[PDB]
Symmetry: D2
Subunit: 455 residues, 4 copies
């Protein structure tokens, strides 16, 4: 049902809560954007599951054995063998984190004017694609855009949308297919192995490349083991290895499922693409032998990726998130369903019926959650969607959500109860939340440092 933690606590960090009066001044001080708050003032930090994970004693043992050589580091070799053994890719290039690998892939695989199609988008991934002259096309199934629809494997690619794209645009005009596991903006929804098989077969018949966004691939592997028929007897590692046999390469953010606080890499099977990747990584990240990472960080990521394959760890990871969602749903709190592997998304539209999407209710619901509970959450709605490049209007996604993101191995069920009990109490008087308007907007990726004012 809900298993206990498959580990012990080795070391702790103390937390505290500042009074609601100070919390209100802090939200004022931060311009009503949860990204501009101070960490010391936060009790439970659910802003992101990225780089906020607790490492194990074995990883920390690896941190003491950092081989910091510019080339030929033992840590690089360990990370290389581990990725080749668990993912199965021929070549491996470390990067400082995920978007570093995306910068390389977009410059290597995109010709200006070509199309890139994926199962929904991500903010940094789509930026690098559009910066290199590509046009993004969403080919996820339509059900992934409906927050309340509770169906399995929402992240799957609509094979008919992919087929119509190939026919209308031509295979030569498609740079590659970008398959993300899991799909972050849909709520952390998994992709089925059958879908990855079908995508591989269809793209291979037209010579189209397929690259994975493997950021949360282990959470995706758990959903396959739990809910896809024919995989209940497969280990997590066997499932992960088979997932990547249907791809030509991948970008990875170790900061998620590799259980580290920094790190990423780029994988590929093609030798010419690997030759050009080594030329480019030196410009932006560093030598191909460390890729903008200290040796101790390559070591921690190599160990963390192997620890992520333990079934009990990933089962507890996902079911802890599920416990938070089941407790909120049992009280009537509207959430995205089904709950994903890394976070619970509060539906701000149903939570703030009085607010409109132009009044930015998700950004305002996140502010209220910290004031009332001392929990930091992230806005995942129209503000994160950005503006259309040609028209200049808001991108309006159906999903206007507030993301409660769970770092791996950091919090307990008692912490989830604190989050749930506080949100449930806020739900009783959800009418008191005010709408917001821009006072400072960045030109790109505005949600990071955008300052708002109440309407």
């Amino acid at each position: 049902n809900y298993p206990a933690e498959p580990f012990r606590i080795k070391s702790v960090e103390t937390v505290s809560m500042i009074p609601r009066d100070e919390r209100l001044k802090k939200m004022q001080e931060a311009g009503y954007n949860t990204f501009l708050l101070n960490s010391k003032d936060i009790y439970i930090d659910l802003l992101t599951d990225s780089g906020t994970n607790a490492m194990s004693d074995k990883q920390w043992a690896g941190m003491m054995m950092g081989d910091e050589a510019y080339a030929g580091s033992e840590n690089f070799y360990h990370l290389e063998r581990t990725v080749q053994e668990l993912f199965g890719f021929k070549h491996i290039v470390p990067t400082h984190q995920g978007r570093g690998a995306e910068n390389l892939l977009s410059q290597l695989a995109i010709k200006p004017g070509q199309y890139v199609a994926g199962n929904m988008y991500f903010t940094t991934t789509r930026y690098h694609q559009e910066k290199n002259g590509a046009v993004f096309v969403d080919i996820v199934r339509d059900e992934a855009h409906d927050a309340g629809l509770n169906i399995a494997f929402k992240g799957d690619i609509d094979l008919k949308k992919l087929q119509k794209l190939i026919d209308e645009k031509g295979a030569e005009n498609i740079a590659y297919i970008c398959l993300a596991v899991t799909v972050n903006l849909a709520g952390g929804q998994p992709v089925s192995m059958a879908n990855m098989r079908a995508v591989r077969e269809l793209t291979e018949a037209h010579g189209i490349k397929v690259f994975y966004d493997a950021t949360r691939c282990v959470e995706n592997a758990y959903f396959i083991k739990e809910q896809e028929q024919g995989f209940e007897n497969k280990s997590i590692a066997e499932i992960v290895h088979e997932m990547f046999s249907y791809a030509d390469g991948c970008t990875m953010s170790g900061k998620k499922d590799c259980l580290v606080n920094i790190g990423g890499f780029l994988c590929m099977n093609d030798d010419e693409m690997f030759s050009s990747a080594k030329e480019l990584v030196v410009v932006y990240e560093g030598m191909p032998s460390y890729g903008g990472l200290a040796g101790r960080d390559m070591e921690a990521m190599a160990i963390g990726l192997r620890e992520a394959m333990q079934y009990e760890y990933i089962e507890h990871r996902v079911k802890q998130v599920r416990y938070l969602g089941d407790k909120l749903k049992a009280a009537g709190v509207p959430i995205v369903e089904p709950v994903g592997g890394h976070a619970v998304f509060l539906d701000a539209r149903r939570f703030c019926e009085h607010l409109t999407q132009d009044e930015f209710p998700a950004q305002s619901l996140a502010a209220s959650i910290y004031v009332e509970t001392g929990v930091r959450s992230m806005e995942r709605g129209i503000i994160s969607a950005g503006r259309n490049n040609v028209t200049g209007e808001h991108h309006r996604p159906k999903l206007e959500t507030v993301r409660l993101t769970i770092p791996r191995r950091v919090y307990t069920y008692a912490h989830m109860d604190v989050v749930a009990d506080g949100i449930i109490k806020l739900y009783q008087h959800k009418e008191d939340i005010r709408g917001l308007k821009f006072i400072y907007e960045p030109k790109q990726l505005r949600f990071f440092t955008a300052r708002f004012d109440y309407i």
Copy 2:
């Protein structure tokens, strides 16, 4: 109520999560003696709360700042300032752990033939008193010997037993009074501030010294803040500082309430005794500037002692233990009452009422608990009692218990559920627990290496 952890997890200790079938194999290889189990085969290790605590990031930062000098280490000075500030004693001598300090105090404060009186005893404390020629006298209140009696401050000293000892034996024939906080053998029961005040008044009138066994003094301070009238507005540190104002010195095991894995010390107000303590500590521990400890450990203990004063930490510590006792008591499982500050004691005499004491029900119940849950607990009954030296018969204690001892900041409430749910399921078919017989019994310390088999 039951508060959430007032901290988050910084790092974890991984375990293997082996199933019941393999757990039985390890238990058989261990001879059905939980003391012979390998740490690597145990999920939740409740053998002892001594030296098994999880340290904070701050303490680990201090571990990197170890001044390993033989004399004049900065870590010693940090530890000295902290103990002088928090405990209020004039002089401070570090020791490698608690029994090191007890060896020193017994040799310094006892003349052969004198008496030492205390609120029950501990094995090592009483040994060093008896090894130095003292005769032990128990002066605890009579209610402390009633396992089922649920009253506050069971550890208080009976002021009339102490007065009767002074009159019959004479003050000059009393080495000192040994007041322990908390009282280990009564189940971790606290002592009231009123009792410590009265003991100080009575002994000072006869010139008798009073030394504390401060091992779990912070847990004792919480019970005073929680249950003694007039201390609800005092901080934990104010209560600790006042407790030691009624003593002339103390022996302390940092391994318990200082939140460390090694370390202890000896405190004193008398200059002559401190002069003699520095001459003796070099014999058994080391210099008065490190006392059988690395500098980094004096630093961790100094930081941990200050962290233990936080009200939210000690409240959660005690209430986590209480949560385990309350859940067992709510199912009808017989336990020692009231639940102490560090452990829950299962009444195995009552749990296995179909077994006689010569069939070792505490030892057999502990083996069953590990096979069913992966939890290691400690037998505290006829096996630990040992054999009489001259007669060769079993020492037969009134308490036949299984001690579930909780390390500080290591486990969560979900782990407490694993312990409780497995024990409750065992209780529901307790008639199937079989008795044990010796197949190997060593001459001494039989609880450590004895091997058994079912009857």
Copy 3:
């Protein structure tokens, strides 16, 4: 003179100490390319001073205090306060290392078609300038191109070349001035404070921006304190703070003079540019609150930058390098003069005068140095120069050198003797060093993976 290390060893990194016969086997397996040697087979690794520094106990204590929050980390604030205090710049943006900051500065400060002028160049710095449409102009003084000329402050900018550029091209057509301290390509040569003052006066009169490449600025500050008249009473920090008072911003690689293994940052006084820098850093590095770094690394870099200001540390750092150069020069071994702050450069064109440049004497001399001593050094000659893109011929640099680059606080004078004694013995039978030919040459980054064999 030559001072002792102003520190003691806290912890060591073990090596294997393999004999010459095995060293030759590894060198053959590495194709006689020191870049292919495994770190675990190298005794003294002088490949680079970048990211190979030994940290202090204090920094490692800060590594235990990593606040890994996505935004508002306490480590970032510590790093921000430190850089603002020591460098004096208004705004600070962290990056994963130096070239990350250079990518940002080039995209923010360069309009396509403008010119960028500097005192020589670095590979990554010039790439990002040229990738963003700038044309590079070298304005260093002519003496910097004379390897044997032993004069102080070889890195100074020729004020008349800068003036001739402003007159011929126009101020509005100049993106900025890139002043590097120290100058890597001249051998690690310092820039005088008088030169920085004069450059600031000239550019400010035309409204031209000046940005520093502050990578080895602390070594530059020592030469100013040592050799520039009027600064002998100034502290290192006062000289550093004054140096940056003549710049509008800087790119910094913490991997060199901040005594860390990863990290860098970008500084600025202009608010609009800082506003645009926060919008761009999210694209390539991460939030402005961590910038592609774990919190623990921002903390180590903040502590290391403060430690670098200690006069005794930087004096020993520079004089250890000087000791190696003086011992080689005292035996007649040809080196670049004057010795720089971070490395000694062997003139391989002169060392192997019986070899032509097409026989790769720098690459062959470096292989011989490893076989005889277990020291890895870097080829900085025709192999590293690469091939011309259109013609396919070797780029033929005037400097054919072997760089002995010294990591900070890693080696002792006895290690410098191992390097010197082996090189001196090679010089005495330098007529036996054989030339090398390609047996594998990759299309790009040939210095990284090329393989050779003797002629």
Copy 4:
């Protein structure tokens, strides 16, 4: 000749020097005893090689994997296997440090009235022997008491003194023979394998037990490999294993040759003695499964003992000490010869010809060395010798020395030059040193906290 360090520096700790005016106040403040000084005020701390060693990255990796279980710790098993494999003893009991093991051995192996004979004595070892009723008899050869006599293997036991002891006193009246390797008070002088064979043969013929003081056994093994004929081809580990085949047990201080900052153990082959050792260690140290050590400390000691067997490490260790002695001897500074494995001993009698042994010149020479150089050294003369138990007069050893003790892997040759250059300058005006007299004397082991005043 003098090899470079067979390791790199992984992390450093900063040091500093306070002015001679403050250094004089500090010596005044400490009562002219170097043990009462503060570590922060010391530049190069040569007080002792005990527990002041720098650990390796591998040991620090082991510190992150401390298994802190009360019983069955993986760290205890690793230490147990390592000691059994390298020393060859059947049973192993950990202790917090060396004198903890001595306390156990003296209580287990000594009957009141028996004799204990050894190659000179040590302060804590002789105390525990005399405390348990034994009378100490020195059976080292007479040449070991002559500081200037330069002969190999000064620590050997005089076989004729041992034979006369057996004849005069009887074999039944000798508890055991205590053979120390190396011999600390003779200057760190080694014992030959031939001597250990002869001692074993002679004692076995009379049934007398032999126990080793293995504190610096690895330094002893190096001298056997270097200077004893027939061992030049043996590895260090083979020599150590053969050394202990001639003993029935050993007491060990890991704080010396196990390259740790805390830790020790007791080894023995007899099962009955091991049974009684487990009963006693619980009283003074802790359970036999950790023996007063944290798990991480057992792990570090298990790794450090294996690293000590590397030939290059121990060769550099000994030759670094030798470099200090050769430099002092080349200037005419009188020292103990030959130099031992862990320290250089300055002969205070030849250094202070004007002072007498009753004026305590060694304690006064140590004070002057810190005032002039900032180096802390230890008095090793009549003050450390103690007083005779029956007469009450000073024990007057021929050796009145000041010990410059070298921690392992902490300092460099440049640090040894600082020590040597400062002592050589002090040697020019050695007449300015004043004599000292007691103002506070402890009852036992007086040198630790004795305060003196000038005469």
